[PDB]
Amino acid sequence: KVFGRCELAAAMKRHGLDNYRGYSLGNWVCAAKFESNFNTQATNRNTDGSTDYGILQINSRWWCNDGRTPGSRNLCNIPCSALLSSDITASVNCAKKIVSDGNGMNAWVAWRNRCKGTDVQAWIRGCRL
Ligand SMILES: [Cl-]
Ligand SMILES: [Cl-]
Ligand SMILES: [Cl-]
């Protein structure tokens, strides 16, 4: 599913991501924009052989099981395929664990490089939330 910008903001809020660990909704929407362009089915293969999955490009080295990332963990206790669903529940619940892991949203390199320090509220501007 490719979400609309406000549609995704609303879904993230519904699932308790808004201001989670102090990160406003615009941060999460911005991260999703640059990780996946709001496409739940996004996948990308990393140089180390791991793969990133879903709207927040969650990585199989630590967070989910895909059966083909040697030496990896599955800390969210989910198949990576769950992160591709039109229902963002699994992605949100896993993101909550990731952002609580110590480095906040810096876990998402694209958030650090493209969202951090910017006017992230622009991502939820105009949205009925
Ligand atoms: Cl915001
Ligand atoms: Cl594996
Ligand atoms: Cl980047």
Curated annotation (Swiss-Prot):
It catalyses: Hydrolysis of (1->4)-beta-linkages between N-acetylmuramic acid and N-acetyl-D-glucosamine residues in a peptidoglycan and between N-acetyl-D-glucosamine residues in chitodextrins. The gene is LYZ. Belongs to the glycosyl hydrolase 22 family. In the egg white and polymorphonuclear leukocytes. Disulfide bonds join 6-127, 30-115, 64-80, 76-94. One of its GO terms (cellular component) is endoplasmic reticulum. Residues 1-129 form the C-type lysozyme domain. One of its GO terms (molecular function) is lysozyme activity. This is Lysozyme C. The keyword Disulfide bond applies. Lysozyme C is capable of both hydrolysis and transglycosylation; it also shows a slight esterase activity. It acts rapidly on both peptide-substituted and unsubstituted peptidoglycan, and slowly on chitin oligosaccharides. GO terms for biological process: cell wall macromolecule catabolic process; defense response to bacterium; defense response to Gram-negative bacterium; defense response to Gram-positive bacterium; killing of cells of another organism. InterPro entries: Glyco_hydro_22, Glyco_hydro_22_CS, Glyco_hydro_22_lys, Lysozyme-like_dom_sf. It is an enzyme of class 3 (hydrolase). It comes from the Eukaryota. It is found in: Secreted. The active site is at 35, 52. Pfam families: Lys. Its EC number is 3.2.1.17. Keywords: Allergen, Antimicrobial, Bacteriolytic enzyme, Disulfide bond, Glycosidase, Hydrolase, Secreted, Signal. Lysozymes have primarily a bacteriolytic function; those in tissues and body fluids are associated with the monocyte-macrophage system and enhance the activity of immunoagents. Has bacteriolytic activity against M.luteus. Monomer. Substrate binds at residue 101. The lineage of its organism: Eukaryota, Metazoa, Chordata, Craniata, Vertebrata.
